[PDB]
């Protein structure tokens, strides 16, 4: 399942993960866990790892409306459209392949993901990650629509997800929450549900059987009975927070969608300059632009060379020696001049 990538995606049960902070103190094994947010690109894209396998339906169909999240039972289905990412404002989402979501957001200190699947009002976590605005270019302006430049820049290439590098799955987990087994006045009883409660107690009903059905063990109290967690048709994402609730690890391959590609970008070039000649000296009267680092080197010998982040109307004293200086003041070509 690659074209409909939900085949390889739903070979693993996309289950919830333990977020510690989701709204001023609380964080449980919800879908609001951000496993890892990596952005390997000069294009400014965030590739976050999301706890649920968003995009796969209850049958793991290629669902444009699908957002496969977790509940106490595995099928915590949600709207694929209702998901929201916000860095400092709502960052523009690009796509989702299972647990790997990809989008573009403005500069900020953390990314917040919020989705309400059946729950009340957008269960959302917010991971601290100081997203910078680190762009290349002689200037430093975030405006794509300049008709000025074309430089090479990396990005998370937006191709259709099969794989370039896969994340490994393993450990159908055992949870840390045993409210399934209860006592009827002398007897432990373990019902069946979306948590596979292996009978794990001192003796009795806590001896065998994953929680797919009820098992009774009389003479049962609060202490001597034990739950356990078991799974099927899946392995955990990484168990990043994810308490390793398996006995052994056995990887599966999930092709990390949005494999990175090198593309181009458009950088605007500012108003060029004014050169005022003099006796071995020149005044580079630059009115400012969106501010950028302009550099002037002295071509020849042990070269007087400087560079300054120009952000105001000024005049650079370019020393224009006999050999000449090389002044690249802005996003223009690096052209420097000779004497006079």
């Amino acid at each position: 399942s690659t074209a409909n990538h939900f085949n390889a995606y739903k070979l693993t049960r996309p289950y919830v993960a333990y977020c510690a902070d989701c709204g001023m103190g609380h964080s449980c094994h919800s879908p609001a866990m951000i496993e890892n947010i990596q952005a390997d690109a000069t294009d400014g894209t965030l590739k976050i790892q999301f706890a649920s396998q968003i995009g796969l339906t209850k049958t793991d169909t290629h669902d444009h409306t699908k957002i496969r999240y977790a509940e106490g039972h595995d099928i915590a289905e949600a709207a694929r459209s209702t998901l929201k990412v916000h860095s400092s404002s709502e960052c523009t989402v690009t796509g989702t392949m299972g647990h790997f979501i990809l989008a573009k957001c403005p500069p900020g200190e953390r990314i917040s993901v919020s989705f309400v699947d059946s729950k009340n009002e957008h269960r959302t976590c917010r991971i601290a990650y100081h997203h910078e605005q680190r762009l290349i270019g002689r200037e430093r302006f975030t405006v794509r629509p300049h008709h000025g430049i074309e430089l090479p820049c990396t990005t998370y290439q937006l191709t259709t997800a099969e794989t370039s590098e896969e994340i490994d799955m393993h450990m159908p987990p055992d949870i840390p929450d045993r409210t399934i087994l209860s006592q009827q006045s002398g007897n432990v009883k373990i019902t069946v549900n979306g948590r596979t409660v292996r009978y794990s107690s001192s003796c009795g009903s806590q001896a065998v059987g994953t929680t797919t059905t009820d098992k009774t063990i009389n003479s049962c109290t609060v202490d001597k009975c034990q739950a356990y967690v078991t799974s099927h048709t899946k392995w955990q994402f990484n168990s990043p927070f994810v308490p390793r609730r398996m006995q052994a690890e056995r990887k599966g391959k999930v092709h990390i969608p949005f494999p990175l590609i090198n593309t181009t970008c458009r950088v605007p070039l500012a108003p060029e300059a004014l050169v005022r000649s003099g006796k071995r000296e020149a005044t580079l009267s630059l009115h400012p632009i969106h501010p950028t680092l302009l550099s002037y080197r002295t071509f020849g010998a042990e070269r007087v060379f400087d560079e300054q982040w120009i952000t105001a109307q000024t005049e650079v004293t370019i020393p224009v020696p006999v050999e000449g200086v090389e002044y690249q003041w802005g996003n223009h070509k690096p052209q420097r001049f000779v004497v006079a």
């Binding site: 094994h29 390997d40 949870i175 840390p176 929680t211 034990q226 739950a227 356990y228 308490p243 990175l260």
Partner: peptide
């Protein structure tokens, strides 16, 4: 002392142990 919501894992009152190992790998990029 695990307190999840998916089956019994914090089922001993004490004596449990969390073995954790990290592995320094090269960056994928």
């Amino acid at each position: 002392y695990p307190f999840m919501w998916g089956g019994a894992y914090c089922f001993c009152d004490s004596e449990n142990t969390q073995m954790s190992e990290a592995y320094v790998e090269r960056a994928d990029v």
